[PDB]
Design a protein around this ligand. Sequence first.
Ligand SMILES: [K+]
Ligand SMILES: [K+]
Ligand SMILES: [K+]
Ligand SMILES: [K+]
Ligand SMILES: [K+]
Ligand SMILES: [K+]
Ligand SMILES: [K+]
Ligand SMILES: [K+]
Ligand SMILES: [K+]
Ligand SMILES: [K+]
Ligand SMILES: [K+]
Ligand SMILES: [K+]
Ligand SMILES: [Mg+2]
Ligand SMILES: [Mg+2]
Ligand SMILES: [Mg+2]
Ligand SMILES: [Mg+2]
Ligand SMILES: [Mg+2]
Ligand SMILES: [Mg+2]
Ligand SMILES: [Mg+2]
Ligand SMILES: [Mg+2]
Ligand SMILES: [Mg+2]
Ligand SMILES: [Mg+2]
Ligand SMILES: [Mg+2]
Ligand SMILES: [Mg+2]
Ligand SMILES: [Mg+2]
Ligand SMILES: [Mg+2]
Ligand SMILES: [Mg+2]
Ligand SMILES: [Mg+2]
Ligand SMILES: [Mg+2]
Ligand SMILES: [Mg+2]
Ligand SMILES: [Mg+2]
Ligand SMILES: [Mg+2]
Ligand SMILES: [Mg+2]
Ligand SMILES: [Mg+2]
Ligand SMILES: [Mg+2]
Ligand SMILES: [Mg+2]
Ligand SMILES: [Mg+2]
Ligand SMILES: [Mg+2]
Ligand SMILES: [Mg+2]
Ligand SMILES: [Mg+2]
Ligand SMILES: [Mg+2]
Ligand SMILES: [Mg+2]
Ligand SMILES: [Mg+2]
Ligand SMILES: [Mg+2]
Ligand SMILES: [Mg+2]
Ligand SMILES: [Mg+2]
Lengths: 200, 79, 86, 79
Amino acid sequence: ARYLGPKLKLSRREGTDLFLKSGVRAIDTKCKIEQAPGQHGARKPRLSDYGVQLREKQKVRRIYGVLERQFRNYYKEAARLKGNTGENLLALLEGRLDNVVYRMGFGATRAEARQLVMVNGRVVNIASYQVSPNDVVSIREKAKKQSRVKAALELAEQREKPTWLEVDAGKMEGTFKRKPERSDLSADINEHLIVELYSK
Amino acid sequence: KIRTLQGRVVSDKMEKSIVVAIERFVKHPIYGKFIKRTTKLHVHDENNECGIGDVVEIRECRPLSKTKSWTLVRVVEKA
Amino acid sequence: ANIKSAKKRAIQSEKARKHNASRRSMMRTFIKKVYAAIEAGDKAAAQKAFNEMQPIVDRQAAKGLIHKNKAARHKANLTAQINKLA
Amino acid sequence: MVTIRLARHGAKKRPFYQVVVADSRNARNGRFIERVGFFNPIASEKEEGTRLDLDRIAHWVGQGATISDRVAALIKEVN
RNA sequence: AAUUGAAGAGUUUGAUCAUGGCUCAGAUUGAACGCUGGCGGCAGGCCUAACACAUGCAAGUCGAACGGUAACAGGAAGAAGCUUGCUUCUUUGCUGACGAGUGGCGGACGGGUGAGUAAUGUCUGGGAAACUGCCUGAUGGAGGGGGAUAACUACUGGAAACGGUAGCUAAUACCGCAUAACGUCGCAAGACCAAAGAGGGCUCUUGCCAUCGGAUGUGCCCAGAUGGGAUUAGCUAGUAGGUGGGGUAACGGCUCACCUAGGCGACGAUCCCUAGCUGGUCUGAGAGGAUGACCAGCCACACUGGAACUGAGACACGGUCCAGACUCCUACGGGAGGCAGCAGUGGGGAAUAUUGCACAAUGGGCGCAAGCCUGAUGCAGCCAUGCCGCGUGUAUGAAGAAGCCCUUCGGGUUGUAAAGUACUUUCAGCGGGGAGGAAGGGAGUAAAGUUAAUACCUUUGCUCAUUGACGUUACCCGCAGAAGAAGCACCGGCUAACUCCGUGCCAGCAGCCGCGGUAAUACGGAGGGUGCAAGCGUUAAUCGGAAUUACUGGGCGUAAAGCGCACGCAGGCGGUUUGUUAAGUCAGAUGUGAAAUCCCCGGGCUCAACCUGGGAACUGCAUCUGAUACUGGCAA
Ligand SMILES: [K+]
Ligand SMILES: [K+]
Ligand SMILES: [K+]
Ligand SMILES: [K+]
Ligand SMILES: [K+]
Ligand SMILES: [K+]
Ligand SMILES: [K+]
Ligand SMILES: [K+]
Ligand SMILES: [K+]
Ligand SMILES: [K+]
Ligand SMILES: [K+]
Ligand SMILES: [K+]
Ligand SMILES: [Mg+2]
Ligand SMILES: [Mg+2]
Ligand SMILES: [Mg+2]
Ligand SMILES: [Mg+2]
Ligand SMILES: [Mg+2]
Ligand SMILES: [Mg+2]
Ligand SMILES: [Mg+2]
Ligand SMILES: [Mg+2]
Ligand SMILES: [Mg+2]
Ligand SMILES: [Mg+2]
Ligand SMILES: [Mg+2]
Ligand SMILES: [Mg+2]
Ligand SMILES: [Mg+2]
Ligand SMILES: [Mg+2]
Ligand SMILES: [Mg+2]
Ligand SMILES: [Mg+2]
Ligand SMILES: [Mg+2]
Ligand SMILES: [Mg+2]
Ligand SMILES: [Mg+2]
Ligand SMILES: [Mg+2]
Ligand SMILES: [Mg+2]
Ligand SMILES: [Mg+2]
Ligand SMILES: [Mg+2]
Ligand SMILES: [Mg+2]
Ligand SMILES: [Mg+2]
Ligand SMILES: [Mg+2]
Ligand SMILES: [Mg+2]
Ligand SMILES: [Mg+2]
Ligand SMILES: [Mg+2]
Ligand SMILES: [Mg+2]
Ligand SMILES: [Mg+2]
Ligand SMILES: [Mg+2]
Ligand SMILES: [Mg+2]
Ligand SMILES: [Mg+2]
């Protein structure tokens, strides 16, 4: 139920930074981001229309560590909800709480943030929890002596912190103010390929 | 009103009884064409008024025999 | 029977069968006398037999041996037939 | 006779009762005449634990419906 | 807000376009099998033999109907080792209670199964000639007698099951009599029909009878709809109708006698084959197609065939009688039994669980109640069967260590992977705390209403104890240490993923095309990789793709397909004008279309699955009122 394997290979297979590393040093110095993994790695054949649609879906999955069954259920939810399905799907993935622990800067990676796993002042230890507009997300007091969370925040303080949220120091809390639009997120995900892949 | 059907007498051979054909015009469930369908009722006719070809109003009543649960109301048209 | 209450019901129902059969037989005997008087074709004999029958069918209806509608039918059928006789 | 009683719905360890008017002989969760309310015994604070259509209950009690012990107790604590 | 919804590909050929089948990608399941397997939540779990069934349990209850007193617990009398105060052996229903018995109510519910049933069924919508325990409203009654009988007692027959004889006794058991009308019969006059007490302290409570209502349940009738076969075309004598008698709760050929000769059928009768029906379920863009397991409604069945009895209700799963096929006990004379209740056994099968705990909750039976009963139900056990959630670490870490594997021997790749070093402790283990599912019921006291009464009773408050099968509960806190926890399929194209070695048309692979005869990305192993993940594959099965049965939505010159040609009955279709009708059609309204499910907006379990509030939907059916262009009818 978790991918517990070498993490750089995913970014290598996708051929893009998926933000899967802590950032103690550069991605180029860590691995060959240009090259796909394995013995036949410097090779790069033509990929089919199917193969392209697959790799876009596997991109959006492998960032978050969402396995296929759970990802499929998000697609179904996104298609069900009113309006644009591809946008609804990204909104649902962005609405997840386990993004937030990482994104607010408590884990160095999402894998670390997931090891570390309060919303509206109530404890929630579920990665898949959909955080709503106007909800305050925050940390406990009992585990603020961990060096992990200290280091992770210093890693977080070099990134561009998200632009629909409000992370705070000390008591360490922030409001999910609104759901992100597609404008907020990377114009790089071609989510129509995922919509098309599941329509197949 | 009280409930009635209208139909054509197709037999008057029984004593105090007639057979009335009710024609209905119904849309075919699959193919959509309107089709003629027929329901034959055994009807009570105390006086033996009706003849083969008459148009008759009939009403539902209590069972009067094995096959009869309808009675004659009027003759609309004699043949 | 396996169950205790079922054994008791079998006994009670047999007792009730005997009791009922006696009263049913008696009631039918009194009804038959009215029909027999009619068959012969004598009104005074039939009205006598009917006046004996009438309390019996009514009482057996009250006791639940027959329904009151059945008692009513017997009185109606025979009153009609007695009226047609002379 | 006709009774007003609780049909047990919900899930395992988490009962939710529908308040139904039924012929007493029918199974608890089976054939009923009319639903007239619900009762959640494990309802969180803020949520409505009990709703009863007391007018419909009064109609049925007027026609000789009995009430289970629990529904009688729920009728008390509501009003 | 609540139908935002529709993808193709491989394979005929030297190549092409078309035609056309085969095959694949998807979704799904009561699944099974193989490999593998950590935890939890919620659900599901004999689809085959309606095969046969050992054992336990699944229906009792009421002493406030009754005689009683086998228990054992008091109480009173009368006496013995006499702990000068009583145990004990005795007597006694006097009292709490209560075995057996009479009586009442229940046993027709609840639970199981799908054999039969293609229409005495089911679904939708109507109807008239009916009954209906318990519950409920109203109006009255509730008087006075009698003969029994079980238990019991004496005798007694049987191996047992189970009786026989005689005597005795009670009632809310049973039976007259009286009373008798908004009841029954009758045109009327008349005639006729009932009943039961018990309990608490005259009064209250409860029961009894009658009649008319209500409610609920059930019986009955009609129309439409609900599989296949014409290589089944005729079927029918109580048959179709009538009259009269009988019968039923009730209409009715329901039955019988007589009379008429009908009735059904190409709009498929009759016969044959298959089948429980529905809400729904799966699939599908939809229209369809497939399906009816779980949950809920209806039906049917209870070892097989038949039958009734009792009863408000049964032709009765754990009742009766008979017969039959089985099987078991026997003193050989006779007797006994029916898991398609729950659990379980054998058998069949690819395959489907424990001879568990509890009535604490909800519901059911009986009871004034306390309570008793309840394999319904609530729970627990077993199983990755499904769905949903979580874990199996996290960070760093070049030495790019070994060992792999490949290499044009430069290197590349596995791989930051491992180690090493910081850390973390969910879940599992171990130890401490702790909801909720409990409402009620029981005690005396509080006031008011009944009342001769400041009584009993009723109700509501009042206070004090007390009720949990699950359960070592959810959940919380603490301890120890990465510790206890990753597999399965695939990598020639379709199809995401490629190399080396072994083999040499062999061994083998294969869904389809194909692959293998010495440099095989196709076989087998390895290294690497891709996809899924506590699962993964395979097989089976349904829909999809398949516009490949084409209603939506196809064809027939040569691909499969125009009868050899005509006439013509049924049937389908019908030029043009006016009037009329209002069947089709259209509009509106009303009733109905169970709940669940689906969908929408919310709510609750930390989330999810799951549970749940309201809505929408249920495309239908019926009725009423309108419209009159078009189609139909009628008239000209
Ligand atoms: K009894
Ligand atoms: K083809
Ligand atoms: K039953
Ligand atoms: K069946
Ligand atoms: K007949
Ligand atoms: K007749
Ligand atoms: K269907
Ligand atoms: K049978
Ligand atoms: K009864
Ligand atoms: K109980
Ligand atoms: K067509
Ligand atoms: K017209
Ligand atoms: Mg999972
Ligand atoms: Mg070729
Ligand atoms: Mg007793
Ligand atoms: Mg039942
Ligand atoms: Mg008396
Ligand atoms: Mg009596
Ligand atoms: Mg009298
Ligand atoms: Mg054929
Ligand atoms: Mg043949
Ligand atoms: Mg007759
Ligand atoms: Mg009939
Ligand atoms: Mg069958
Ligand atoms: Mg289609
Ligand atoms: Mg079924
Ligand atoms: Mg069907
Ligand atoms: Mg009877
Ligand atoms: Mg029974
Ligand atoms: Mg049985
Ligand atoms: Mg069983
Ligand atoms: Mg076997
Ligand atoms: Mg028992
Ligand atoms: Mg490929
Ligand atoms: Mg080779
Ligand atoms: Mg298949
Ligand atoms: Mg099709
Ligand atoms: Mg074609
Ligand atoms: Mg040819
Ligand atoms: Mg040809
Ligand atoms: Mg020709
Ligand atoms: Mg011609
Ligand atoms: Mg015309
Ligand atoms: Mg019309
Ligand atoms: Mg509904
Ligand atoms: Mg016209």
